[PDB]
């Protein structure tokens, strides 16, 4: 990437230290990349960190110079998501073909399947988009995460 | 600096020159500092003129004063830096939260530095910390 935006990435990297020795933990690494606009799976981040265990994730440290090629690897992926695929998977839970999924089902699927969110992560995501019947339009819910 | 600051500064210069002409020398400081209280040592009479790269006339003192007030931030920046820690509009950033922000979670001030900071900003001890009057004290307009 150009030096222009690489200079911004230096400012953002310095804004995730909580101490002062200029190091970002392996545990923090995905959410630094997400701050800089990227949307990577946990298994995409983990792979570029060499597959560490949970214990050493809290103890292993990155500097900017070694964080920066990780940003360059995950920046060109071989795919990315859209709107067209993402509504199709949430429409399976649209009980009669309403255009709406029940807020309990949507909380339950994101926690139970795949990259398994916490109860907190789903509650923060869906709140205020579920109506008087507790029903969430999947169309605008996808637009909310994607467009930002 | 501002026009009001220039008038106060011009009157301060005119009461820190002690024999006039239109310069300030060692003796001007040594007599006046004795008159307004307890003088420092001669070391700090000498070390107060070697800040200035030329003779300590009104312009040189104004540059020396103005330059060493240049590297600071406007009060409104401080006001909307305090008012970035409150979520509710009762903008008193309470101690023992504000303590951690200075003593462990920022560029972390040592025990001496925090004692001076909370001595010249009234943590009463019984009355709680506060906000913008410890931005005015920090800048000028109070003490």
């Amino acid at each position: 990437f150009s030096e222009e935006q690489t200079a911004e990435f230096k400012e953002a990297f310095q804004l995730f230290d909580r101490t002062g020795d200029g190091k970002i933990l392996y545990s923090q690494c995905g959410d630094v990349m997400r701050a800089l606009g990227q949307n990577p799976t946990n298994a995409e981040v983990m792979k570029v960190l060499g597959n560490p265990k949970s214990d050493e994730m809290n103890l292993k440290t990155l500097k900017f110079e070694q964080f920066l090629p990780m940003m360059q690897t995950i920046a060109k992926n071989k795919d990315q998501g859209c709107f067209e695929d993402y509504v199709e998977g949430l429409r399976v839970f649209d009980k009669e073909g309403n255009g709406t999924v029940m807020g309990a089902e949507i909380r339950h699927v994101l926690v139970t399947l795949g990259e398994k969110m916490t109860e907190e992560e789903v509650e923060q995501l869906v709140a205020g988009h579920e109506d008087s019947n507790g029903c969430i339009n999947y169309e605008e819910l996808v637009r909310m995460v994607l467009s930002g | 600096f501002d026009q009001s600051q220039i008038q106060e500064f011009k009157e301060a210069f005119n009461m820190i020159d002690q024999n006039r002409d239109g310069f300030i020398d060692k003796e001007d400081l040594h007599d006046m500092l004795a008159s307004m209280g307890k003088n420092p040592t001669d070391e700090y009479l000498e070390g107060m003129m070697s800040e200035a790269p030329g003779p300590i006339n009104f312009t040189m003192f104004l540059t020396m004063f103005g330059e060493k007030l240049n590297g600071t931030d406007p009060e409104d920046v401080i006001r909307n830096a305090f008012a970035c820690f409150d979520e509710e509009a009762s903008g008193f950033i309470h101690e023992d939260h504000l303590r951690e922000l200075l003593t462990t979670m920022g560029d972390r001030f040592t025990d001496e530095e925090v004692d001076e900071m909370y001595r010249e900003a009234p943590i009463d001890k019984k009355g709680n910390f506060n906000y913008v009057e410890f931005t005015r004290i920090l800048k000028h307009g109070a003490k």
Partner: protein
């Protein structure tokens, strides 16, 4: 799905299918579902993380702003040249109230001149409202009659 016509047959309500062929359209079922889930993968986490970051990525440079002022305060305060200014400006009020004494007793001369102006000015206005009582009726009388002459 370009199904071969030997693999299916079409009935009246149902589609008959050769052995295996349902289970491929089926595998698909486990496979198809477990990953296009699998997703939300970091679209939701990727949204939440940057929103949580921007609970202080508006704090970014306003912040720090406190600390470098606190750092400037102690080191401004405890360096020598400013220690003189710190006590001299409080003395300038005893002497900037001395400035205020000169301004005040000068103002007292202007202050009694306002009292002298105001009584005279009120009488001048009282006289000219008496006249402007007369002006309002006579100009109104003139204005009507002038229109009657125009007709």
């Amino acid at each position: 799905l370009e199904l071969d016509p030997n693999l299916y047959r079409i009935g009246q309500s149902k589609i008959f299918f050769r052995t295996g062929v349902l289970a491929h359209l089926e595998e698909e079922r486990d496979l198809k579902i477990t990953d296009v889930i699998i997703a939300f993968q970091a679209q939701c986490r990727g949204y939440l993380a940057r929103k949580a970051f921007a609970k202080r990525q508006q704090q970014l440079t306003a912040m720090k702003v406190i600390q470098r002022n606190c750092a400037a305060y102690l080191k401004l305060r405890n360096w020598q040249w400013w220690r003189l200014f710190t006590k001299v400006k409080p003395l300038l009020q005893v002497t900037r109230q001395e400035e205020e004494m000169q301004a005040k007793d000068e103002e007292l001369q202007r202050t009694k001149e306002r009292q002298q102006k105001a009584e005279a000015e009120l009488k001048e206005l009282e006289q000219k409202h008496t006249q402007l009582c007369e002006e309002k009726n006579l100009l109104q009388e003139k204005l009507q009659a002038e229109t009657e002459l125009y007709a």
